[PDB]
A = this chain, B = another copy of it.
């Protein structure tokens, strides 16, 4: 259950969602 909780792209406080968002932020800002 906890793993599927952390991999929840719908919930914005989920870790994976924040990681992906910040990664795209940085990636597009540099290029």
Q: Which residues of A contact B (CB under 8 A)?
A: 1, 3-4, 7, 9-10, 16-17, 19-21
Contact = CB atoms under 8 A, between A and B. Distances in A.
B10 A7 contact: no
11 contacts: A1-B16, A1-B19, A1-B20, A3-B7, A4-B7, A4-B9, A4-B16, A7-B7, A10-B17, A10-B20, A10-B21
Copies of this chain present in the complex amount to 4
Give me the 9 closest cross-chain CB pairs, A-B, nearest first. Answer: A4-B7, A10-B20, A4-B16, A1-B16, A1-B20, A10-B17, A3-B7, A1-B19, A4-B9
Contacts of A16: 1, 4
A1 to B, nearest CB: 6
